Amino acid sequence: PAYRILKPWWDVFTDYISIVMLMIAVFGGTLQVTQDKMICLPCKWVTKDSCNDSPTGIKYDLDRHQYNYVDAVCYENRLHWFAKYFPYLVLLHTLIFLACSNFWFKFPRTSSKLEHFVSILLKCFDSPWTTRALSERTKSRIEQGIVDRSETGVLDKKEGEQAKALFEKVKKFRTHVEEGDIVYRLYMRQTIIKVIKFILIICYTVYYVHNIKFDVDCTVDIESLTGYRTYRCAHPLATLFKILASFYISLVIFYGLICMYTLWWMLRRSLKKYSFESIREESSYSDIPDVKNDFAFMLHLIDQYDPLYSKRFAVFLSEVSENKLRQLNLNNEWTLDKLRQRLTKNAQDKLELHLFMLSGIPDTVFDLVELEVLKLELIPDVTIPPSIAQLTGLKELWLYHTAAKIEAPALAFLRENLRALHIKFTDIKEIPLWIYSLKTLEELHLTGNLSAENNRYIVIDGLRELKRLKVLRLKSNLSKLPQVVTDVGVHLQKLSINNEGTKLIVLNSLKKMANLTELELIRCDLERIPHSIFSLHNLQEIDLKDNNLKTIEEIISFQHLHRLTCLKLWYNHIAYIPIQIGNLTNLERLYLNRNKIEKIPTQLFYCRKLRYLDLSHNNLTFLPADIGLLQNLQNLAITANRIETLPPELFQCRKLRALHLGNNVLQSLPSRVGELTNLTQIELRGNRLECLPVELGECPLLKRSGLVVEEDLFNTLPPEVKERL
Amino acid sequence: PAYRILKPWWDVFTDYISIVMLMIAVFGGTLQVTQDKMICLPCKWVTKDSCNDSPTGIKYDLDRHQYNYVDAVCYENRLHWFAKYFPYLVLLHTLIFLACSNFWFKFPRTSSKLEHFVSILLKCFDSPWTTRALSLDKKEGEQAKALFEKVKKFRTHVEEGDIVYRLYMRQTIIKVIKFILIICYTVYYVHNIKFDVDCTVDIESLTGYRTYRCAHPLATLFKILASFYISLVIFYGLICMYTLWWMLRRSLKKYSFESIREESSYSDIPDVKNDFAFMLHLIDQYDPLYSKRFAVFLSEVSENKLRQLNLNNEWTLDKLRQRLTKNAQDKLELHLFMLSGIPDTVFDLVELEVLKLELIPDVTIPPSIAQLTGLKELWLYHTAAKIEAPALAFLRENLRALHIKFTDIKEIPLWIYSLKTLEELHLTGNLSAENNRYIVIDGLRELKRLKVLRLKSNLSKLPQVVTDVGVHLQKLSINNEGTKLIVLNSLKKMANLTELELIRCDLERIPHSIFSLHNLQEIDLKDNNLKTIEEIISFQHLHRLTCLKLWYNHIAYIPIQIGNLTNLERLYLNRNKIEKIPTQLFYCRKLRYLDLSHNNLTFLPADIGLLQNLQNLAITANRIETLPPELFQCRKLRALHLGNNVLQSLPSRVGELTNLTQIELRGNRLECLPVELGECPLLKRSGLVVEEDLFNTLPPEVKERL
């Protein structure tokens, strides 16, 4: 694996230098062992030393054998020890350089981190995901760039899984390697020792060259054995060894110069610190990490092998890349088969789908042409890719605290759709300035707490142009409603304020609007009904509940209005009903629930078209004979009021489909109510009935679904209601 | 591998010569170590002339050991300097030349370029796309595309390099320098190789004799080796000099594909001017075929074809036909919503009068439209606009209607004025005052032929290009924003105006420049800020109004000037909260269609019984009590839409008409329904939405009969 981490001036030159150094050691060694003769010969003209101060010949008269002895003595007991062991010296130095350059290689405490690093290196130029990743007023409303750049391509569960595995591995391997700096320390130590040995070697070997000589004056003490005292002696190899020493010294200098470069490099710039600054300078990916340890160091070393590596690695190790990967992987798995698992519907169905557990917006959801409603919950980076064009209808979109980043170029589609839009928000500005750009939005639901200032800025710029707004629901404190509401208010059909922090005067709004065909004040801290509410001639519905409203005495002037048709007064403190309610007959709904009503005058009977009445959780203990006049009564609750046994007027009606009786006193339901034949359900609970009537057989719609009873015995009818079930 | 980037008359020869030269160093080295003896011997003749010539023996009483000393001395400080180190001179230079040859390989900043270069060439060489490109099974697209992306990134990277070229030149130059020097030294120092030499070293104090004659035993082998060596080197040098000639008389820093371009299918190839060019020349030397395969692969024209084929192989004629539908004014509506371009197969659909394109980049519609017969209508929305096909005649014979939608300003093409046969145009988009004025002039000014024009936009002011073109205007519509109601000099210019529509515009009051337009014959005012009908008094004096829609407004009051009109075929009083209807509508006995809904009427007047031709009557969500008997005093009442009112039961008599085709009964709280209603021949569960069977006699009979 060394090849892919091969260092330009650390491994390349060192290996060739080392080979040459070894070669010269071997050459010299071979010669030193067998070609070194050291030819000595005696001399007669000895004056002081050197046998000088001087044809037939000399005739020294010595034995050929004894000359070899002299040679051996002069060789052993004289100078030039450097020359004698020069190739061994070279071999040692060569081996030192070779060994010191390769401690990390094949040594487990360092090779482990290199193996993890190299494994990554071999994946950066593989796993095609990498090369896909390498392919690269406003008012936060423009993102067509990313729409076309992604090319809506896929990974086919191959690049997806490969890249995912590599993300797990790059994060884990980095966490492992990043713990320390052993790889770093070894290279700094190695670089320094190479320089140290270099300096010492040159000093040592350039000095001992004066030792290599043509000849030597041999003055060893052997004349008592061999006759002559002084010998002159030649060393033929000495010429060659001066040459070899010179070549070795030059070779070491070259090595040294390169080693100084590498030591120079590792000191001039920090190597542990490392980041892909060059990538964020050139590439679209600014998401560049920086760590200071062995991982970064090893990346830095290979940065000088090939910049291409850095480009591949840098784009891979990114959260931008991972997020694009995840969205693509989402599409790979979250297909039509998975979307179908959640295609539910609740009421006014419109074929819903709610995506809650997704980390982003799938593209496959827009293949669900049949749906009209899409609910997005807690999903970040919602752009709504402009591939919603294959949908036909889109009647409702829920931005349930997701993201304000809706910038895809598909307003034309949305402007032909989205009758309704729901925005849930906990922050102030995650509400996009996108809403007003929609023109066909009729219904808008805004839920979250904004200050008066925030209401004014968000509503004026984000909503004011919704000329077709007909329905507006504000689940906000609304200490003041911005003038936008009153202006849309003249075309607005429904306005609903539903919050505990509601404390304000709405008289101006009511007067300006003068329409409000549906009005809701829920949990608003109200005690007083604003009197201008009676200018809403087309009010047609009013829901006053969960208020501090303790009176109905104020509803005197309701006849100023026409077609009221509905009055909801539940969960309030109206413990008493006056005789103004009897003048309200153009009413088709009335609800008095948990208001602690002690008494109701016979006034409800005047509203002979009431048909629907809720009398519950009131300390009333009474039923008037209004019930005998309202012969179109279809639904009535008489519960939690401790009423005595029901009076016979109970059944003097025609339908009373919903007969809800409970938490009262009823030893027995008047059996005659069973002859209405239109009972669909009878609730008989908490009343201590002794027995059940056996006249219910007359009614075909009291099969065992509507028999909400405690006893379910004392009868002959159980098999009839069971078979009908 | 490296083989394919080796130079034909350079590298194979360099390697063989280097091997032989090293062989000479090895032979000579071994020879020099064990065979060089220098047998020297003294002489007694005149030493002034190296022992000249002016049987038993000479004896020369010296010992054998002493002679070894003489030989050693003569060898060490006399002649044969060159011969003594000849094989080392050979080894050193041979290694230098060899190292120089391989210098560019395994070099820190050349290997990466070379490895990628070779891999790309091999992939291009063997890719089936290259073959097809010479003129995909849905996989060659991906493979070729991946190679194209890699090639573009590789080329971009190599584009900035000048390393491979320069290092090669430095290498060539140093080989030439060393070549000249090695010849100068090797050739010159040959006079020192002699068999017979004269040794006159000063060793008399040790040997008696000063002059020795001496025989170098390997003089001949070193002369032979040197001569053979010199010849090897000269040959090597010829190649080195050739290299410089080739490198200097050819730019090589640039490479053109002209010799291939005029033989192959492509034309779009740039002049390469960097290390890529140099590498290209080198493969051209090895084999030009690789230059060709690469060139054929790397082409934008080829990429275009590759992608086009991918479209054609997916969006086949069956795929297109299966997805071909029709919704209104049918004409074979084919929709292409997410394509990367337009497949050619769409133009073989000769019968495809309607093509709808959206979200398709770079649409160009190559002129193959001549293949088609009918192309009566074309919808280009939110796509691209690069159709410059030289085939206006085909387009002019067709394209009676164009529906083009935009998101910006400059996206709008000008293919409108060039088609003077255009009859109907629809434009939606982002407008401003000046932006619209400039574009509408360039777009519509010359279309005298235009009859129908509809604009969906934030216009804010009516342009005069439209009023001038508008003198031939049949139908005019504008919506989604209020404009200055420039009517005083617009309706008068247009003057034909046989169908006018105003939707979601800031109209509170009706303009009165329409009052004299007797040729109006159709008018639709809806979702406006209009809250009245006071203006419509003299308006209706015009004959042939035939249609008046005032729905979706705030008109809660109907006057009795409505009786001024006798010619109306459509009347819509929808969602205006009206509280009463006068018996002044019947005046238009040709009305036939009357929408009374989402009002606050609560009752109906005796007007229905005066319209014997009333066919379609909608009475819904008006809280109306039991309908008056005039309800069924008619002849047709095909559609009786009742709902969200108050009706205990239908009068049995309405079912005796028998021309009822549908009765809607939803939300009216009916207690029961009479049997006569089931006698009507066309109420056999034909759209008879009811809540319950309502105690009728023949609901299962009519269900089976249908």
XYZ file of N, CA and C in Angstrom, chain A residues 8 12 16 23 27 31 35 39-43 45 52 55-60 62 64 67 71 125 131 134-136 214 232 234-236 239 243 247 304-308 386-387 389-390 412 416 467-468 491 493 515 517 538 540 563 565 588-589 609 611 655, chain B residues 33-34 43-44 60-66 68-69 72-73 75-77 85 88 91-92 95 106 108-109 112 116 142 149-150 153 157 204-209 335 337-338 358-359 382 405 407 456 481-482 504 527 529 554 577 579 600 602 623 625 646 669 671:
378
model
N 7.111 12.003 -2.369
C 8.011 12.601 -3.393
C 9.488 12.790 -3.100
N 10.923 8.209 -2.591
C 11.395 8.066 -3.958
C 12.907 8.126 -4.035
N 16.220 5.044 -4.155
C 17.283 4.840 -5.137
C 18.675 5.115 -4.569
N 25.137 -0.884 -3.148
C 25.959 -1.382 -4.242
C 27.427 -1.020 -4.048
N 30.581 -3.698 -3.585
C 31.740 -3.694 -4.466
C 33.030 -3.588 -3.665
N 36.199 -6.538 -2.899
C 37.603 -6.276 -3.181
C 38.449 -6.316 -1.927
N 41.187 -8.866 -2.842
C 42.169 -8.181 -3.670
C 43.156 -7.345 -2.879
N 51.626 -5.115 -0.540
C 52.943 -5.648 -0.905
C 54.069 -4.877 -0.241
N 54.755 -5.503 0.703
C 55.830 -4.836 1.412
C 57.184 -5.394 1.018
N 58.219 -4.591 1.210
C 59.559 -5.045 0.902
C 60.544 -4.288 1.786
N 61.619 -4.944 2.199
C 62.634 -4.360 3.066
C 63.419 -3.295 2.368
N 64.141 -2.516 3.161
C 64.970 -1.463 2.606
C 66.231 -1.309 3.444
N 68.803 1.493 3.045
C 69.289 2.847 3.308
C 68.521 3.576 4.399
N 65.471 6.325 2.963
C 65.774 7.106 1.773
C 67.194 7.604 1.892
N 73.098 -1.187 -13.333
C 72.123 -1.670 -12.361
C 72.076 -3.180 -12.396
N 72.092 -3.803 -11.232
C 72.052 -5.252 -11.171
C 70.911 -5.785 -10.327
N 70.445 -5.021 -9.362
C 69.404 -5.438 -8.447
C 69.881 -5.225 -7.026
N 69.120 -5.723 -6.062
C 69.460 -5.538 -4.657
C 69.907 -6.819 -3.994
N 69.128 -7.888 -4.166
C 69.340 -9.178 -3.515
C 69.217 -9.030 -1.993
N 67.971 -8.823 -1.545
C 67.732 -8.667 -0.115
C 67.960 -9.941 0.680
N 65.826 -12.695 1.229
C 64.755 -13.120 2.115
C 63.901 -14.195 1.462
N 60.622 -16.130 0.276
C 59.317 -15.767 -0.278
C 58.223 -15.912 0.772
N 58.266 -13.090 3.349
C 57.747 -11.823 2.889
C 56.266 -11.737 3.165
N 54.207 -8.794 5.149
C 53.010 -8.147 4.631
C 51.903 -8.178 5.662
N -11.402 7.366 -4.928
C -11.380 7.329 -6.383
C -12.227 6.172 -6.922
N -18.119 10.830 -7.560
C -18.058 11.575 -8.803
C -19.380 12.230 -9.125
N -19.044 15.378 -7.075
C -18.080 16.264 -7.720
C -18.607 16.927 -8.978
N -19.843 16.634 -9.401
C -20.388 17.225 -10.622
C -20.458 18.744 -10.563
N -20.539 19.316 -9.365
C -20.571 20.758 -9.218
C -19.144 21.284 -9.091
N 48.873 5.618 -1.314
C 49.667 4.853 -2.264
C 50.579 3.904 -1.507
N 59.146 -0.731 3.118
C 58.325 0.226 2.387
C 57.152 -0.611 1.923
N 53.343 -1.044 -0.369
C 52.306 -0.572 -1.289
C 50.925 -1.191 -1.074
N 49.883 -0.373 -1.227
C 48.490 -0.792 -1.065
C 47.739 -0.481 -2.355
N 47.809 -1.347 -3.379
C 47.155 -1.096 -4.689
C 45.707 -0.652 -4.638
N 44.210 3.366 -4.454
C 43.761 4.333 -5.449
C 42.257 4.233 -5.610
N 38.799 6.808 -4.704
C 37.710 7.045 -5.644
C 36.370 6.643 -5.044
N 33.093 9.004 -4.175
C 31.767 8.757 -4.726
C 30.752 8.529 -3.622
N 0.378 16.240 -1.382
C 1.525 16.527 -2.214
C 1.859 15.403 -3.175
N 1.056 14.351 -3.178
C 1.211 13.249 -4.100
C 0.332 13.591 -5.291
N -0.944 13.922 -5.031
C -1.939 14.259 -6.046
C -3.060 15.152 -5.504
N -3.294 16.360 -6.059
C -4.423 17.188 -5.576
C -5.778 16.582 -5.860
N -5.815 15.654 -6.813
C -7.059 15.003 -7.172
C -7.622 14.254 -5.991
N -40.119 21.673 -7.683
C -41.088 22.024 -8.727
C -41.456 20.866 -9.636
N -41.870 19.773 -9.039
C -42.289 18.581 -9.730
C -43.604 18.177 -9.141
N -46.121 19.588 -10.555
C -46.846 19.739 -11.795
C -47.534 18.445 -12.182
N -47.073 17.292 -11.708
C -47.833 16.121 -12.109
C -49.051 15.938 -11.219
N -46.640 29.045 -10.128
C -47.762 28.947 -11.052
C -48.658 27.775 -10.682
N -52.689 27.983 -8.900
C -53.881 27.439 -9.521
C -54.558 26.469 -8.555
N -56.381 38.646 -1.446
C -57.676 39.263 -1.722
C -58.828 38.269 -1.649
N -58.568 36.993 -1.927
C -59.587 35.955 -1.859
C -59.669 35.286 -0.511
N -64.283 41.142 2.972
C -64.561 40.059 2.048
C -64.495 38.750 2.801
N -65.250 35.825 5.274
C -66.502 35.212 5.664
C -66.438 34.692 7.087
N -69.742 41.588 8.262
C -70.229 40.384 7.610
C -70.041 39.169 8.508
N -69.787 35.695 8.497
C -70.824 34.665 8.461
C -70.550 33.510 9.404
N -75.309 39.255 8.727
C -75.177 37.940 8.137
C -74.376 37.007 9.027
N -74.978 34.434 10.971
C -75.314 33.020 10.706
C -74.675 31.919 11.564
N -81.353 35.410 10.213
C -80.820 34.091 9.926
C -79.674 33.722 10.854
N -79.510 31.217 13.069
C -79.514 29.757 12.932
C -78.662 28.980 13.938
N -81.497 27.017 14.725
C -81.581 25.592 14.446
C -80.598 24.791 15.281
N -79.922 25.443 16.221
C -78.946 24.810 17.094
C -78.805 25.579 18.396
N -88.344 25.434 15.568
C -87.465 24.905 14.549
C -86.077 24.649 15.115
N -84.747 21.976 16.787
C -84.397 20.607 16.394
C -83.196 19.943 17.077
N -89.003 12.391 16.517
C -87.794 11.643 16.211
C -86.944 11.367 17.437
N 39.051 -6.645 -12.484
C 39.397 -7.057 -11.130
C 40.330 -8.256 -11.112
N 40.062 -9.272 -11.928
C 40.902 -10.465 -11.813
C 41.985 -10.660 -12.867
N 65.318 -3.515 -17.286
C 66.170 -3.605 -18.457
C 67.494 -2.893 -18.204
N 68.545 -3.358 -18.890
C 69.901 -2.836 -18.724
C 70.389 -1.960 -19.859
N 68.631 -10.545 -14.238
C 67.956 -9.513 -13.451
C 67.745 -9.950 -12.000
N 68.803 -9.992 -11.212
C 68.669 -10.580 -9.878
C 67.796 -9.799 -8.892
N 66.481 -9.947 -9.080
C 65.422 -9.391 -8.253
C 64.581 -10.564 -7.766
N 63.962 -10.442 -6.598
C 63.144 -11.551 -6.118
C 61.737 -11.465 -6.706
N 61.000 -12.583 -6.647
C 59.634 -12.593 -7.162
C 58.767 -11.608 -6.412
N 58.927 -11.577 -5.098
C 58.140 -10.669 -4.292
C 58.402 -9.236 -4.710
N 59.680 -8.937 -4.902
C 60.120 -7.628 -5.333
C 59.497 -7.268 -6.669
N 56.544 -8.200 -7.620
C 55.152 -7.825 -7.415
C 55.085 -6.366 -7.029
N 56.063 -5.930 -6.230
C 56.133 -4.521 -5.865
C 56.296 -3.651 -7.093
N 53.104 -3.434 -9.052
C 52.147 -2.595 -8.357
C 52.474 -1.131 -8.525
N 53.744 -0.773 -8.388
C 54.105 0.629 -8.516
C 53.863 1.123 -9.914
N 51.830 0.052 -12.090
C 50.397 0.156 -12.278
C 49.826 1.412 -11.632
N 50.149 1.640 -10.367
C 49.584 2.754 -9.609
C 49.941 4.148 -10.109
N 51.202 4.422 -10.451
C 51.499 5.810 -10.806
C 52.006 6.033 -12.226
N 39.827 2.540 -15.335
C 38.509 2.828 -14.835
C 37.468 2.754 -15.916
N 34.022 1.443 -15.104
C 33.265 2.216 -14.158
C 32.724 3.443 -14.837
N 29.710 2.020 -16.462
C 28.611 1.819 -15.528
C 27.956 3.120 -15.131
N 28.758 4.100 -14.726
C 28.217 5.378 -14.294
C 27.368 6.022 -15.361
N 24.136 4.011 -16.197
C 23.107 4.196 -15.191
C 22.483 5.569 -15.305
N 7.216 7.392 -12.502
C 7.375 7.401 -11.046
C 7.861 8.761 -10.560
N 6.801 12.396 -8.971
C 5.740 12.974 -8.133
C 4.574 13.683 -8.799
N 4.782 14.388 -9.906
C 3.642 15.070 -10.491
C 3.448 14.751 -11.968
N 0.211 10.786 -11.792
C -1.232 10.945 -11.683
C -1.878 11.348 -13.004
N -4.419 8.595 -15.152
C -5.773 8.925 -15.570
C -5.890 8.955 -17.083
N -25.530 5.463 -19.372
C -24.875 5.666 -18.081
C -23.369 5.515 -18.166
N -18.242 12.616 -18.049
C -18.015 13.468 -16.889
C -16.577 13.346 -16.408
N -16.055 12.120 -16.391
C -14.681 11.922 -15.962
C -13.710 12.579 -16.926
N -13.727 16.374 -16.365
C -12.994 16.773 -15.165
C -11.497 16.549 -15.347
N -8.574 19.400 -15.328
C -7.405 19.314 -14.470
C -6.102 19.385 -15.262
N 64.614 2.994 -7.535
C 65.972 2.439 -7.541
C 66.474 2.074 -6.159
N 66.138 2.871 -5.147
C 66.607 2.572 -3.799
C 66.046 1.263 -3.251
N 65.004 0.725 -3.873
C 64.398 -0.525 -3.468
C 64.645 -1.662 -4.439
N 64.912 -1.359 -5.714
C 65.087 -2.385 -6.729
C 66.356 -2.323 -7.560
N 67.149 -1.282 -7.471
C 68.347 -1.218 -8.306
C 68.090 -0.679 -9.700
N 67.056 -1.179 -10.356
C 66.741 -0.742 -11.696
C 65.713 0.372 -11.700
N -49.071 14.728 -22.864
C -48.361 15.543 -21.898
C -47.008 14.944 -21.546
N -44.115 15.965 -18.997
C -43.955 16.749 -17.780
C -42.587 16.818 -17.074
N -41.709 15.827 -17.201
C -40.402 15.736 -16.547
C -39.267 15.295 -17.454
N -43.876 20.575 -20.366
C -43.571 21.357 -19.179
C -42.314 20.827 -18.525
N -41.574 21.740 -17.890
C -40.365 21.421 -17.140
C -39.319 20.698 -17.981
N -43.575 26.657 -18.793
C -42.542 26.497 -17.799
C -41.527 25.470 -18.277
N -46.857 29.653 -20.980
C -46.783 30.176 -19.616
C -45.361 30.467 -19.161
N -42.529 32.344 -16.057
C -42.242 32.765 -14.692
C -41.421 34.050 -14.638
N -53.403 36.114 -18.146
C -53.454 35.897 -16.699
C -52.240 36.594 -16.112
N -55.980 40.195 -11.351
C -55.545 41.461 -10.788
C -56.306 42.608 -11.422
N -56.491 43.671 -10.656
C -57.158 44.824 -11.187
C -56.247 45.628 -12.087
N -61.669 38.277 -11.235
C -60.798 38.658 -10.115
C -60.024 39.934 -10.382
N -66.093 37.290 -9.413
C -65.114 37.409 -8.327
C -64.542 38.819 -8.303
N -64.864 43.062 -7.087
C -65.212 43.789 -5.875
C -66.562 44.466 -6.028
N -70.791 40.655 -4.684
C -71.464 40.967 -3.430
C -72.816 41.617 -3.697
N -75.618 36.474 -1.861
C -76.445 36.734 -0.686
C -77.689 37.551 -1.037
N -81.450 38.662 -1.165
C -82.573 38.312 -0.309
C -83.895 38.193 -1.060
N -79.679 34.391 0.173
C -80.422 34.376 1.426
C -81.878 34.672 1.162
N -84.758 32.600 1.033
C -85.729 31.946 1.930
C -87.088 31.665 1.256
N -81.811 28.400 1.934
C -82.728 28.262 3.072
C -84.174 28.457 2.651
N -87.963 27.673 1.994
C -89.058 26.855 2.501
C -89.699 26.138 1.332
N -85.132 24.023 2.686
C -86.064 23.373 3.593
C -87.228 22.845 2.772
N -83.646 18.191 4.205
C -84.453 17.648 5.300
C -85.792 17.070 4.837
N -88.807 14.653 4.446
C -89.440 13.612 5.216
C -89.764 12.452 4.310
